[PDB]
Design an enzyme around this catalytic site. Sequence first.
Site, PDB file in Angstrom:
ATOM      1  N   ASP A   1     -44.136 -46.593   9.394  1.00 28.54           N
ATOM      2  CA  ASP A   1     -44.371 -45.159   9.293  1.00 28.54           C
ATOM      3  C   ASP A   1     -43.055 -44.379   9.274  1.00 28.54           C
ATOM      4  OD1 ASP A   1     -47.283 -44.715   9.148  1.00 28.54           O
ATOM      5  OD2 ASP A   1     -47.281 -45.905  10.982  1.00 28.54           O
TER       6      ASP A   1
ATOM      7  N   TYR B   1     -53.935 -42.951  10.866  1.00 20.39           N
ATOM      8  CA  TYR B   1     -53.359 -42.930  12.212  1.00 20.39           C
ATOM      9  C   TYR B   1     -52.655 -41.627  12.584  1.00 20.39           C
ATOM     10  CZ  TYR B   1     -54.500 -47.470  14.040  1.00 20.39           C
ATOM     11  OH  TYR B   1     -55.203 -48.540  14.574  1.00 20.39           O
TER      12      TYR B   1
HETATM   13  O1  LIG Z   1     -49.519 -45.141   7.846  1.00 21.32           O
HETATM   14  C1  LIG Z   1     -49.066 -45.416   6.545  1.00 21.32           C
HETATM   15  C2  LIG Z   1     -50.134 -46.193   5.770  1.00 21.32           C
HETATM   16  C3  LIG Z   1     -51.196 -45.277   5.152  1.00 21.32           C
HETATM   17  C4  LIG Z   1     -50.840 -44.200   4.347  1.00 21.32           C
HETATM   18  C5  LIG Z   1     -51.826 -43.392   3.790  1.00 21.32           C
HETATM   19  C6  LIG Z   1     -53.169 -43.663   4.036  1.00 21.32           C
HETATM   20  C7  LIG Z   1     -53.518 -44.735   4.844  1.00 21.32           C
HETATM   21  C8  LIG Z   1     -52.534 -45.539   5.396  1.00 21.32           C
HETATM   22 CU   LIG Z   2     -54.087 -49.837  16.721  1.00 21.78          CU
END
Ligand SMILES: O=CCc1ccccc1
Ligand SMILES: [Cu+2]
Lengths: 620, 620
Positions: free
Chosen positions: B290, B374
């Site tokens: 992230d 998340y």
């Molecule tokens: O957290 C980064 C991965 C992600 C990005 C956008 C949508 C779902 C998952």
């Molecule tokens: Cu988790």
Amino acid sequence: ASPFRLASAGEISEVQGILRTAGLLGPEKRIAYLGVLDPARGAGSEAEDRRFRVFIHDVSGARPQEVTVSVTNGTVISAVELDTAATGELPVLEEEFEVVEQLLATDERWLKALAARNLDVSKVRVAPLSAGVFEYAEERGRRILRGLAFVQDFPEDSAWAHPVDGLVAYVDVVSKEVTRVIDTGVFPVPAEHGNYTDPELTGPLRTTQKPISITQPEGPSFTVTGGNHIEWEKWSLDVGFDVREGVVLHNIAFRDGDRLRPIINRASIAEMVVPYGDPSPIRSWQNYFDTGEYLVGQYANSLELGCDCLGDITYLSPVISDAFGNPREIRNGICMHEEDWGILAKHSDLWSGINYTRRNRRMVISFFTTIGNYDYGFYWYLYLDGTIEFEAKATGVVFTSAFPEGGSDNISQLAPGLGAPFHQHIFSARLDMAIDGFTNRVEEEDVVRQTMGPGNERGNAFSRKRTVLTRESEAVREADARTGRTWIISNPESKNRLNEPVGYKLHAHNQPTLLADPGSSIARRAAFATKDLWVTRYADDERYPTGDFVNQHSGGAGLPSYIAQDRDIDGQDIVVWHTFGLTHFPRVEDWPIMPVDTVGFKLRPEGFFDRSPVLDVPAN
Amino acid sequence: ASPFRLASAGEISEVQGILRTAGLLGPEKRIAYLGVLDPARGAGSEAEDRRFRVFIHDVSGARPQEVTVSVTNGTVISAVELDTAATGELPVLEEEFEVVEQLLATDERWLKALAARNLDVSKVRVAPLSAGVFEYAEERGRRILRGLAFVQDFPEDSAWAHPVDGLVAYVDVVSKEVTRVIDTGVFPVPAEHGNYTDPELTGPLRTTQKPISITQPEGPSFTVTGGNHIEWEKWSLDVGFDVREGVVLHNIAFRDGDRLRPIINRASIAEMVVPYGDPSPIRSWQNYFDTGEYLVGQYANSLELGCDCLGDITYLSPVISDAFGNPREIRNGICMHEEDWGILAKHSDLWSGINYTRRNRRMVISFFTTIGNYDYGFYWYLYLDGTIEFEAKATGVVFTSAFPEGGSDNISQLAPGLGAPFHQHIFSARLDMAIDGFTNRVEEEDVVRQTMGPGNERGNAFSRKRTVLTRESEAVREADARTGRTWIISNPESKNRLNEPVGYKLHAHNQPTLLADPGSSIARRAAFATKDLWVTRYADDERYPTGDFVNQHSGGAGLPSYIAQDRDIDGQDIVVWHTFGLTHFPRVEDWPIMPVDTVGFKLRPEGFFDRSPVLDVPAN
Ligand SMILES: O=CCc1ccccc1
Ligand SMILES: [Cu+2]
Ligand SMILES: O=CCc1ccccc1
Ligand SMILES: [Cu+2]
Ligand code: NA
Ligand code: NA
Ligand code: NA
Ligand code: NA
């Protein structure tokens, strides 16, 4: 109405009258412990019978007695004379605290030791320390305390700043004889004071702190009925109080829709021990069980609004017995309040456009106790999401010694000439489990690493394994932080909507357990402290991990004796005993009064609910 | 005046003008990262030079560039063309989030896969997931995203409840080609919705919660000057903000009497990684950084008074660049407030008669970010007694899959047919230490058990040992909870009044580190996550534990490359990198939206002060 209500002053007065009438409470008798017994298993009979257990000491040398009385019926149920050389001595009495200093003050050997150090006997305080069991054959079956000396320069002086090292005395408090005085040499008594209210030491007080005002304009969200029954945010429980254990939680349950679902039948801190790691003969015997030897509940503080407990506080004032059977109230001895606890759940969704935030809160039940130099806060917490947490807060004044010229491997220096021996603070939580009822089992859960290869070609897989503990002989477990070890208490006969057994997961802090050599006296008497987790089959008389009579007991009582029965614990009425503690290498910042340090554990639901239990929490 | 002030909108506008005038910001260019550089070491020259670092992406296929500009002087300092096959791709752009779904919607292979499952293409959301580096030679030097599909039944539906398992696509977002569509078979799309605001799911909202009112009638105890300089209860620091790292703390110091004493020069969360432990080829590639790949600071939420932050709140609104160099304010992106924190110190003395209680409090600096499913809260805490603590709060929606018929060792079931793959959340804290100045060293401290025998006749002694880490090659350390392992950062040239080096002790949570096989792609790219503690010699260009360009980098960049220099770290300008994380086996209670779970670390003074630093706290 409730069998779990707090003891009343009238109940204690009746106990006193029953004991007196039966000839059990003459002028030489002292009550060393008094407490209400819990209802036996299967109380679906509505048979109200309030029974009290009493330990009766005799100051003339006669054998002490254990007595059970029924206040409901006004009868002595049983009375047993104790052979203390066999089963252990009775807990320390508050009135013995001063007897050690008094007896030493007229002993010529003690006086010669103080005279050599030019210490005035009227300024010398003596700490009344439990004796343990070591090499002294003449102590078997005698009630012994050991004394360590501290100088008070004036009545309001902190004596802890002025330890008299190189000097220890042993006292028989029943025959009133000083058995031994050991003087291994003169150490300078540390001269700096430790008076944390002296402006000389504090400097000018800060003027920079603005007030924080915490109020509940509509009152608290919990209700208290029948004296000690709590309902809060789907939680329900009864708050008990025992002079040995302190606050005890009964009947912890959670209202899930229409059903009240049990979780924990009884939760308590059933023992605590503070072992010292200094090999000097002045202190190498020193291990005190605040719970088992001194009874932490009788030293609970009266808690001050705004100072000890802040917010909208509801108090309980528990009643205990004094040494003559008179009732004594501990005014404001228990604080209860709810606290904001930050964010509970939050999500801003890129595709739905919905932004969602909910706040958390916890219910707090706490008390504070003081035993000599140390002070401890015991905190139980209930959270909105089903988490249960315990936290011990350790503060007070560290136990001191001299700091030897040329240093020490087992003592840290706090001030010029002033030391603090290494030690631990170790607790035992006794959790009488009732996850959705009494058919429970414990599984040990480890993370499982997997090897790169067929079925795991990119080497990313990992998993977990669960091992059921089926008999007590295999239910003595150690922590393993590296493999993420936790323990799950589940009910195999109660399933969630995914057809999986409902459960709760115990998360430990994974702090070191007892450091002493396994062959030591303290390892035998505090065997519970050598392992992180024990599981036993429930039994009425198996109350404390160290046994009923800890003081001067020679070892092995309690948990190592219980688990030798090797009983079935796989889907049975079981009790979890969790050992957790702090290892304290004292720092300069711990002196002259110690900022709080903490340790604890928590339990979180693990497939207990069919989905998040806090979807019905409003947006505030 | 301060070189550590937040970037202003005018500074960003000047950067845009400088880049444009230099020919570096045409219509095919996008700013993928923009951030202010910290002052170099030895800024005792009063040479104000605000420099910004920029990563410039090119949507036509030309090579991207790294550029450093001086807004003070209005010049380009340097501009370098990047070979991305060598040094890594640029961070993911927000505007690419929708390109993956758009490109797949016109690909015949994707359409055939959706048609077989009877899914309408207009209802299918595609998550834009980072690609990593695996076996696909044709991806080297190309900008690849991978797509996993979720169904939205209506515009406000939570798509996470409806994963389309058995289907994954790879997309080249610069040439706009779908390179591969992999369909391993049809799984039922889980049918239950996960709409946590639907009254059908929540039931009626609780009416039992009474308000908690937290106010400061005289305002807060901290002051904010120069935009982002904080003074609070002897603490002083600067609050920075960077689009990659989020909140950054500079110049943490403590006023001890007349001296301002440095402690930490710069503190940040410099990387985080979420590796998935499901061996299915649909997800076995899935690891997202992230911080390094997506930049958590650009997705910071605007925090709502009363909801996200409760009490007397002071906000900062940091300014960042959009993809064209326009300034964009994050309104109310940082909350700052002080919180009551229970008892600080307490003692009731049996011999002096003095009863003493003081309350604790902490300063809170926090922000919240959202990246897809998340959401994370980042919390920094300063306590009265000199403790510094960090806490990550993880919430949001778990990443889902189908739950296979016949179970899974690597996925837990949340609802009928709905699974959640096992994964970890691992963070790296970068602590540029400055304990009383820059001459620092790190010692590893273990508890030492001692054997019963001569000099320890009762078997009670225990001790500790400290090992100095002297070179980077020996400064890669693992946790050991069983031996109470901690790390001490001390200044050997600055002594307390007991003539001992001043220090701070790092306490870890001792959670498991990276579980993946050491030969895996993720173990190479997230090597920092395999060990609990790293110490490096400070260097200007050594900023992130994974290197500057994490996206599609093939491995080994960052910490394993830095420590190969084997530099002297014994009494030098050093940086501590602490890895800590959560291992998440999802539970039913995590669905449909997850209650907060937490992980973190803390540092406490260890002989830094000459006695308790909170003796001057008043009685309130
Ligand atoms: O957290 C980064 C991965 C992600 C990005 C956008 C949508 C779902 C998952
Ligand atoms: Cu988790
Ligand atoms: O905590 C029990 C040991 C003790 C009791 C009284 C004074 C000092 C120490
Ligand atoms: Cu301690
Ligand atoms: Na015995
Ligand atoms: Na039980
Ligand atoms: Na490369
Ligand atoms: Na440094």
